[PDB]
Scaffold this motif. Structure first.
Motif, short mmCIF file in Angstrom:
data_model
loop_
_atom_site.label_atom_id
_atom_site.label_comp_id
_atom_site.label_asym_id
_atom_site.label_seq_id
_atom_site.Cartn_x
_atom_site.Cartn_y
_atom_site.Cartn_z
N UNK A 21 26.16 -39.51 24.92
CA UNK A 21 26.65 -38.04 25.76
C UNK A 21 25.09 -37.60 25.64
N UNK A 22 24.18 -37.59 24.69
CA UNK A 22 22.66 -37.20 24.80
C UNK A 22 22.09 -37.79 25.77
N UNK A 23 22.33 -39.12 26.46
CA UNK A 23 22.06 -39.94 27.62
C UNK A 23 22.31 -39.00 28.77
N UNK A 28 20.93 -40.97 32.30
CA UNK A 28 20.67 -42.32 31.99
C UNK A 28 21.66 -42.95 31.03
N UNK A 29 22.78 -42.76 30.95
CA UNK A 29 24.08 -43.46 30.11
C UNK A 29 23.71 -45.03 30.26
N UNK A 30 23.53 -45.40 31.52
CA UNK A 30 23.52 -46.78 31.78
C UNK A 30 22.66 -47.59 31.04
N UNK A 31 21.73 -46.71 30.68
CA UNK A 31 20.49 -47.28 29.55
C UNK A 31 20.60 -47.61 28.40
N UNK A 32 21.87 -47.24 27.79
CA UNK A 32 21.91 -47.56 26.49
C UNK A 32 22.80 -48.81 26.31
N UNK A 33 22.10 -49.91 25.75
CA UNK A 33 22.64 -51.11 25.77
C UNK A 33 23.27 -51.70 24.17
N UNK A 34 22.68 -50.78 23.34
CA UNK A 34 23.18 -51.11 22.10
C UNK A 34 24.57 -50.87 21.84
N UNK A 35 25.31 -51.85 20.74
CA UNK A 35 26.61 -51.77 20.65
C UNK A 35 27.10 -51.39 19.19
#
Ligand SMILES: CC(C)(COP(=O)(O)OP(=O)(O)OC[C@H]1O[C@@H](n2cnc3c(N)ncnc32)[C@H](O)[C@@H]1OP(=O)(O)O)[C@@H](O)C(=O)NCCC(=O)NCCS
Ligand SMILES: CC(C)(COP(=O)(O)OP(=O)(O)OC[C@H]1O[C@@H](n2cnc3c(N)ncnc32)[C@H](O)[C@@H]1OP(=O)(O)O)[C@@H](O)C(=O)NCCC(=O)NCCS
Lengths: 162, 163
Positions: A21-23, A28-35
């Motif tokens: 949500x912060x991204x 750049x939400x698609x930048x978050x790769x952590x699961x």
């Protein structure tokens, strides 16, 4: 109305959601790769690489989708060669409909206690020059402004150097 | 010639000396309020707030004042919410008379080994933007360059909020 408390393994899914949500405020939400697995493994194993505080609200106050966590702060400890131990706040977010009730202030309050417990000399964090709101929020609480460039050597090369 | 090994509570006196010799270049060796006591407690107490690698030379190559430690690297693990754990190199220095022989490169090989052990996806560190030789020194090692404002909430204020 809400409870600020340390995160637990089962909060990881909520933490990922908020990070994302912060991204979106950065586009750049698609930048978050952590699961959720990475977060559990990295934050709740023997050696956590980060620490989290979350804001949990009562059932009759959950989000429409049914989420009970409406805010969080991610942090870790760093060290400065001149002054020593510091508390470094990495992320801080409160969902839109849950802002204004004192959740952010309560979170900062708990972060201050973690800092004094650590015997940390100060709490450092970043703020976008364009996000005046967050600025005025922090300034009213004692925050003050504090020519180097951040470089990066990826595993690819690190493995080669090894 | 030299040997890179992890630091011990015993090397804190030398780590401090190097911290100050580095600050000297900016005539700010007085900005160091940290003492040997702090480095020992912060580094070798129940919880390490940092980690250090030191460069040790044999008696034949000690310094004029008789020190065997001619360089170090101070680091700690950080976390990025988008990609995960990182190895953060806070300080990296080698006494002037001792650079050029390969000590730094040896320290980077070790930091790299720590990064692979941590299974850290990357090693971050600050570089003087104006410093060309430095930048290329890193770019030659795979390094690549990466509008935020740094803020700080000092102790007085933290105490206010915490009470
Ligand atoms: C900065 C932020 C992380 C703090 O979290 P929070 O949960 O809202 O924090 P708090 O509830 O303790 O109050 C923070 C602030 O909102 C301001 N606020 C509260 N109700 C408000 C309203 N109805 N209209 C405008 N500002 C308001 C307050 O003045 C206060 O800052 P201050 O005490 O330094 O003057 C969060 O507000 C945010 O992301 N803001 C972005 C801009 C926005 O949503 N506007 C704030 C409206 S509440
Ligand atoms: C940056 C620093 C840590 C590097 O450590 P160092 O001891 O100089 O390390 P090295 O000797 O391996 O430096 C590599 C260079 O020395 C020479 N060198 C190293 N080993 C060599 C060998 N076996 N044969 C010939 N030349 C060699 C090379 O020209 C080489 O550059 P390259 O690897 O890109 O080709 C050191 O220069 C220093 O402390 N910096 C100056 C102080 C300061 O103001 N900066 C601190 C901020 S981080």
């Amino acid at each position: 109305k809400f409870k600020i408390r340390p995160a637990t393994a089962s909060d990881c899914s909520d933490i990922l959601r908020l990070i994302k949500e912060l991204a979106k405020y950065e586009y750049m939400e698609d930048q978050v790769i952590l699961t959720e697995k990475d977060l559990q493994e990295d934050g709740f194993g023997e050696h956590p690489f980060y620490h989290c505080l979350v804001a949990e609200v009562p059932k009759e106050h959950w989000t429409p989708e049914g989420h009970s966590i409406v805010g969080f702060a991610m942090y870790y400890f760093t060290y400065d060669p001149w002054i020593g131990k510091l508390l470094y706040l990495e992320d801080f977010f409160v969902m839109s409909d849950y802002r204004g009730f004192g959740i952010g202030s309560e979170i900062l309050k708990n972060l201050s206690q973690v800092a004094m417990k650590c015997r940390c000399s100060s709490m450092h964090f970043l703020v976008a020059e364009w996000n005046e709101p967050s600025i005025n929020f922090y300034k009213r609480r004692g925050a003050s402004d504090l020519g180097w460039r951040l470089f990066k050597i990826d595993k690819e090369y690190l493995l080669k150097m090894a």
